[PDB]
Design the sequence.
C-alpha cells in the first residue's frame, strides 16, 4: 500500500483522542490507483478553499469518473472487488485526513446502489443508467437542497441586511452573492478569520469580485464591531442528534457573544449533513493538522523566512499544538433551514426517520 | 502655562515629548522612570520658595503631558502621586506656620464646610522613595503571590510581556514541586514575538510550554485552572487595559465557564480616572502588519486594535506589593494614595 | 522532647498541604509544662460542640488562669523563658488542632501586651492590672458586641416567620432562643445537621430545652423541604481580605439552594475575626482531620457495628478523605450583622485598618 508511521512531533500530554501525522510526496504507488483520487489527496493535504460541502461534491464527481472508466471483467463479476476497491480508497482518505458525515452517507448510498442492481443485467446498459441516477441524486441532495436553503433565507432575511459570518461554507457564499446581484439589496457583510487558514480572506476576496462592502475581521477583537450587528450565520459542517454543531474554529466564542448581546445565532444546512452519531465537547473527536502551519510570520501562505521560529524538538521541550474542529453549543443556534425546510436543533433528529 | 521657560531651564523635555508621541520610549516602567527624572531635573535647577504656585505649575505640566497622549497613563500617575505627597506635607507645614481629628483617615463633610524649612530636601527624598518603590515592587509581591498556586493545575497566560510578570512566574517555578502547566496565546498583531520570547524564557528555566491560537480558548477553558494577567493600566470600577490582543473574549469565556482570574498589579500602574465608554479608551492598531498590498483595500475594510479594555464583571484579584484586592473595592486603595481634586487637571 | 511519626490511614493524592495527623494518647514530654494547656488541647482535639464563637473565649480564660498562676523566677525577669514557654504551647496547639484567625488575633494581642509593660516591675502589681485589663477587653469586644448583634437581629424580624438553619453558632442559638422566649413571635425553626461534627443535633436539643416548634433534616433532604417558608440563617467562622465566606462545612450548597428558590440568606459576624491572610479556595489552608469522623453507621455517635466497613490501612487503593472548613461564594449571602449593625460583605477589610 505504501509508507506508514515514522514521523516527527510528540504524542502530546494534552489531547490525544485521534492520531496525528501519512502520504504527501508520492513514491512506489500501486499499479491500479486512479490519479484523480491521488490528486485530490494532494490538494486536501494543503487545502485553502474547500470545507464540508464542496469536498463531498468533488468526491462524488471522482467516483462518477471512476465508474465511467470501469467495465465488467471476463473473470470477475460487477460486484466482486468494487467494494474492496472502495474500502481501500476510504482507508487512503482516512490516512490522508479524517472525513465528514455527508461523505459517509454518500458511501452508504453507493453501497446500497451496488446491491440494488443485480449482476445479470447488460453491462453497458447498467452503468448508463447508474451515472444518470447518481447525477440525479447529486442534483437533488445538493443543488436542489442549496436552492431550497436560498429560498428559506429569502423569506426570513429582512429588507436591507447586515450579515456577519465565519468560514468558507459555499452555500452561504452563494446566498450572499444571490442577495447582492440577483434579488438586489444593501448588504454589509462582515467576515472573520483565524491565523492558520485564510478561508475568511478568500470569501472576502470572492465577495469583492462580485462587488460587496466587506469588513475583514480577526479574533483579538470581535466585540469592537458589535458594540449594530443584527443578523448572523455560522460555519456549518455537521450536526449531531443531541442538537449541537461540530464546526470550524472559534465560532463557538462568537455564538456565545451573540447570545450575551441581544440576538440569536442561526445556521443553514443540507438535509444530508445530519448524522445519527453524537458528542458534546471540544475534546471528544479532534480534527488535527501539523503544528507547522504557524511557524512562519503571517502575511501570506508560501513564504520561506529566517528569524527565530522553528523549534519543535530543538529547545528544552516545546509543544505548539492547535485544533481545527470544535464544539458549537445548543441553546443558541435556534435556526435550521434544510431540504425539509424548517425546524429547531432542539428537534435534533425529527427528519432522520423521515429521510 | 505653555512651554516658554521649560526648554532652556530643563534640557530634555522636548526629547521626552518626542519619545511619548513617536514611541521612541519602551516600557511603562521606563516611562515612569523618565518622568521621575524630569521631575528631579525640574526640582534641582529651578527655585520657587512659593509653594501653591509651584504646585499649580506642576499640575499644569502633568495635564499637558496627559493631553499629549490619551492612552499612556503611567507618566500622569507618577506626577499625581508626587502631587499627593507634596500636598500632605504642605498641609502639615501650614499648621506649624500658623502656630481637629477625623473618625478614620479621611472625612467626607470637610469638602462642603469651610476648613523657611528643609522642604526641598524632603521633596528630593520623595522622588528617591518613588524610584525605590518602582525598582522593588516584586520583592513586595513575591510573598503574596506564592499563596494561591497549587499542584496539578493548568495556568492560562494571555499577554505575557513585562519583566514583572516573568519574574513572578520564575519565583513560583523555583519551587518546582508546585505543579503548574503554562498555556500561552500568541496574540495576533503585536504580542506574537513577545509571546515567543516569553515561551523561550520559560523553556530556559524548565517550565512546561503550550503555545495557543487565539480562536482556540473555548476548547481549552474547561480544562484551565487559574488565569494570570500582567496589565498596563488599572481603573475605577474594577476593569483593566492590558498590553494588547485577546483578553476580552478570553474573559467572556472565563465568565461563562466560571474561571479564577489573577492579575499582577501596582498602585502606580493604577489610574483613578473612570472609563465610561468603549468609544474612547480602547486603542486601535495598524493594518500594516495584517496584509501586504493596498489595491484590495479599496473595497474591503480591515478592523484591528492593539490594546484592549476589560469589564470588571470577570477579573477577581489584584496581586500587588500591598496585597490581592477585590475589583469592586480597589477604588479605596487608589484613594489611599490619590484624590478627587487631582482628577480633571 | 516530644513525639513525631506514625500516622493513621492512606494519604490519598490531592489536598496534600495542611496538618491533619501525633499525641492522641500521651507518652513522654518536656518537664516544666502547666497541664491546663495540654488538657485544653486534648479537649479541642476530641470536641463535638465547639464552633468558632467559644474557642477563643476558652483560650482567653486559659490564658487568664495561667497569668493568675504565674510565678516570676528568683533569678531572671518576668519574660525570659516565658516567650519560649508560649512558643511551646503554640506548637502543642498546632499539633493538636490548628490556630484559627481569632486565636491568631488573641496571640497578637498577647504579644502587644507583652511589649506594653517591658521588664522593670515586680509581681503582684503588674499582673493584678493585666488580668483586669484583659477581662475588661473581653467584656468590651466580645459580649457587648454579641448583645448588639442580638438586638439588631430582634428588629430584623417583622411579621410571620418560617426559617431553616445550620451550625453550632453559639450566637445563632442565643438568637433563636431569644426569638422563642423574650419576643414571643410566630417563630418556626427547621434544623439541618452534618456528619463531620454534630452541631445540628445540639441545636435541636437546645431548642427542645425551650420547647420550640422544630422540624429536623439534613444536607440532602431539602428538595421536598420547601413544599410559606422564607428566612435562612448561617454562622460563619471568619472573613478574609477578599470578602469571601471562609467558614465551616455545610453552608454553601444550602445558600445556593436558597438563592435558587427565590428568598435570600443572612449571616452573622464579629468585629475582630477579619484577617489580612489572603486566599480564594478551600485548598490553600483547611481544617483537615482524621477519617474516623466517617466510621459510624448512622442514627447516633456511640453504637459501633460490624456491618460492611471498618478498615483503612489494609484497603489497597481506596482514598477516604473529608474537609471541615469551606470557602463560600461571595455574592450569595446578602446581609451581614457585625458591630456597625448592617452592611454588605463587599466591605471585606473596612474594619481591618480601622483595627
Sequence:
Amino acid at each position: 500500500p505504501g509508507i506508514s508511521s515514522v514521523i516527527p512531533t510528540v504524542l502530546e500530554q494534552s489531547f490525544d483522542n485521534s492520531s496525528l501525522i501519512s502520504v504527501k510526496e508520492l513514491l512506489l504507488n500501486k499499479d491500479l490507483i486512479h490519479p484523480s483520487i491521488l490528486l485530490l489527496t494532494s490538494h486536501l493535504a494543503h487545502y485553502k478553499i474547500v470545507g464540508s460541502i464542496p469536498r463531498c461534491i468533488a468526491m462524488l464527481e471522482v467516483f462518477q469518473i471512476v465508474i465511467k472508466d470501469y467495465q465488467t471483467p471476463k473473470g470477475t463479476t460487477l460486484s466482486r472487488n468494487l467494494t474492496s476497491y472502495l474500502s481501500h480508497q476510504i482507508d487512503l482518505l482516512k490516512k490522508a485526513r479524517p472525513l465528514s458525515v455527508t461523505m459517509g452517507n454518500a458511501i452508504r448510498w453507493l453501497k446500497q446502489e451496488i446491491s440494488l442492481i443485480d449482476p445479470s443485467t447488460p453491462d453497458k446498459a447498467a452503468k448508463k443508467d447508474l451515472c444518470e441516477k447518481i447525477g440525479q441524486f447529486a442534483k437533488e441532495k445538493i443543488e436542489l437542497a442549496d436552492q431550497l436553503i436560498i429560498d428559506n433565507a429569502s423569506t426570513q432575511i429582512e429588507e436591507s441586511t447586515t450579515i456577519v459570518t465565519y468560514g468558507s461554507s459555499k452555500v452561504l457564499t452563494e446566498l450572499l452573492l444571490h442577495n447582492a446581484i440577483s434579488l438586489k439589496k444593501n448588504i454589509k457583510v462582515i467576515v472573520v478569520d483565524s491565523r492558520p487558514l485564510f478561508e475568511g480572506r478568500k470569501m472576502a476576496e470572492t465577495l469583492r469580485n462580485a462587488g460587496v462592502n466587506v469588513m475583514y475581521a480577526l479574533i483579538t477583537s470581535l466585540d469592537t464591531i458589535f458594540n449594530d450587528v443584527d443578523y448572523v450565520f455560522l460555519g456549518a459542517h455537521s450536526i449531531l442528534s443531541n442538537g449541537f454543531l461540530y464546526s470550524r474554529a472559534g465560532t463557538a466564542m462568537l455564538a456565545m457573544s451573540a447570545k450575551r448581546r441581544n440576538i440569536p445565532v442561526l445556521v443553514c444546512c443540507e438535509s444530508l449533513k445530519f448524522s445519527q452519531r453524537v458528542q458534546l465537547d471540544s475534546v471528544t473527536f479532534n480534527e488535527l493538522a501539523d503544528p507547522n502551519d504557524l511557524v512562519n510570520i503571517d502575511y501570506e501562505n508560501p513564504v520561506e523566512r529566517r528569524g527565530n521560529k522553528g523549534a519543535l524538538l530543538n529547545q528544552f521541550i516545546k509543544e505548539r499544538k492547535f485544533e481545527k474542529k470544535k464544539l458549537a453549543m445548543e441553546n443558541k443556534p435556534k435556526g435550521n433551514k434544510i431540504g425539509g425546510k424548517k425546524g429547531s436543533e432542539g428537534e435534533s433528529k425529527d427528519a432522520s426517520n423521515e429521510e | 502655562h505653555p512651554n516658554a521657560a521649560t526648554s532652556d531651564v530643563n534640557v530634555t523635555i522636548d526629547t521626552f515629548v518626542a519619545k511619548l508621541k513617536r514611541r521612541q520610549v519602551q516600557g511603562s516602567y521606563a516611562i515612569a522612570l523618565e518622568t521621575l527624572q524630569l521631575l528631579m531635573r525640574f526640582i534641582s535647577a529651578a527655585r520657587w520658595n512659593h509653594v501653591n504656585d509651584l504646585i499649580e505649575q506642576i499640575r499644569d505640566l502633568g495635564n499637558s503631558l496627559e493631553k499629549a497622549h490619551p492612552t499612556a497613563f503611567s507618566c500622569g500617575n507618577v506626577i499625581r502621586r508626587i502631587l499627593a505627597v507634596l500636598r500632605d506635607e504642605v498641609e502639615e507645614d501650614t499648621m506649624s506656620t500658623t502656630v481637629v481629628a477625623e473618625p478614620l483617615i479621611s472625612s467626607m463633610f470637610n469638602l462642603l464646610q469651610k476648613p523657611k524649612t528643609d522642604y526641598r530636601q524632603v521633596a528630593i527624598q520623595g522622588i528617591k522613595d518613588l524610584i525605590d518603590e518602582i525598582k522593588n515592587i516584586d520583592e513586595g509581591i513575591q510573598q503574596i503571590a506564592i499563596d494561591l498556586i497549587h499542584d496539578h493545575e493548568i495556568l492560562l497566560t494571555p499577554t505575557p510581556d513585562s519583566k514583572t510578570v516573568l519574574k513572578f512566574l520564575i519565583t513560583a517555578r523555583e519551587r518546582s514541586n508546585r505543579t503548574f502547566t503554562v498555556l500561552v496565546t500568541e496574540g495576533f498583531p503585536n504580542n506574537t514575538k513577545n509571546a515567543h520570547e516569553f515561551a523561550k524564557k520559560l523553556a530556559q528555566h524548565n517550565i512546561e510550554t503550550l503555545v495557543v491560537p487565539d480562536s482556540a480558548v473555548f476548547a481549552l477553558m474547561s480544562r484551565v485552572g487559574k488565569v494570570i494577567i500582567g496589565t498596563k493600566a488599572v481603573f475605577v470600577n474594577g476593569g483593566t487595559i492590558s498590553s494588547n490582543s485577546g483578553v476580552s473574549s478570553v474573559c467572556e469565556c472565563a465568565r461563562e465557564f466560571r474561571t479564577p482570574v489573577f492579575a499582577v498589579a501596582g498602585l502606580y500602574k493604577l489610574s483613578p480616572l473612570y472609563p465610561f465608554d468603549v468609544e474612547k479608551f480602547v486603542e486601535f492598531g495598524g493594518s500594516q502588519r495584517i496584509l501586504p498590498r493596498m489595491d484590495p483595500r479599496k473595497r474591503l475594510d480591515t478592523v484591528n486594535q492593539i490594546t484592549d479594555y476589560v469589564p470588571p464583571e470577570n477579573i477577581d484579584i489584584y496581586i500587588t506589593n500591598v496585597g490581592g484586592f477585590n475589583p469592586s473595592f480597589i477604588y479605596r486603595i487608589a484613594w489611599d494614595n490619590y484624590k478627587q481634586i487631582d482628577v480633571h487637571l
Q: What stands out?
A: Chains A and C do not touch (no CB pair under 8 Å).
